[PDB]
Design a protein around this ligand. Structure first.
Ligand SMILES: CCC(CC)CN(C[C@@H](O)[C@H](Cc1ccccc1)NC(=O)O[C@H]1CO[C@H]2OCC[C@H]21)S(=O)(=O)c1ccc2ncsc2c1
Lengths: 99, 99
């Protein structure tokens, strides 16, 4: 699909058996999801943005389906106010900026 | 142009007659630039990011050229970690997401 930016680029994703709404975010290096109880091993990490840093849990090789396009990579879980699909997964679904 | 996302989508902008580097950030509602001097009036504003809220100076109707594409809109100036171009200006240059 083609997504205009009049409104936030929110799309439905599937992760860990759950459906969620997430932002297609070209400004996010990594993918950050709202707090969720994923299984498996993880590593602590801190990511910075406007307002400072938040502490997140890094899970590796996590499958996410973004509007039917499958992807697998690193997913950070923490107290983010928004589900954020970052460039690590946007590349995998063939997403591009165009103007 | 068509921009892939294997690298951070950085572009050169011209604002107030000065060239700068900025990040095309579809996850940002607004455009936020690092501390700089801008001519004209400004109002104190607050914006929230992943790490909290910050104080910014809001400049309205500012000319900004992004990759030779002209835009005129609101530009916030404050302690952002990176110069980001938000949807308020991305829409003006006809920017869309495509996958
Ligand atoms: C460093 C570049 C920007 C921050 C400057 C990075 N952000 C992604 C943005 O898209 C962020 C994503 C975002 C969206 C909404 C709430 C919190 C974060 N949006 C944002 O902060 O926009 C602000 C300006 O306009 C306002 O509209 C949204 C908030 C305001 S982020 O959320 O902080 C982020 C995401 C993954 C990541 N991986 C390593 S660092 C890192 C930082």
């Amino acid at each position: 699909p083609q997504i205009t930016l009049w409104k936030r680029p929110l799309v439905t994703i599937k992760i860990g058996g759950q459906l969620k709404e997430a932002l297609l975010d070209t400004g996010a290096d990594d993918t950050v999801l709202e707090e969720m109880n994923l299984p498996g091993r993880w590593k602590p990490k801190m990511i910075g943005g406007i307002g400072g840093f938040i502490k997140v849990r890094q899970y590796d090789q996590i499958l996410i389906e973004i509007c039917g396009h499958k992807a697998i990579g690193t997913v950070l879980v923490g107290p983010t106010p928004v589900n954020i699909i970052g460039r690590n997964l946007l590349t995998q679904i063939g997403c591009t900026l165009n103007f």
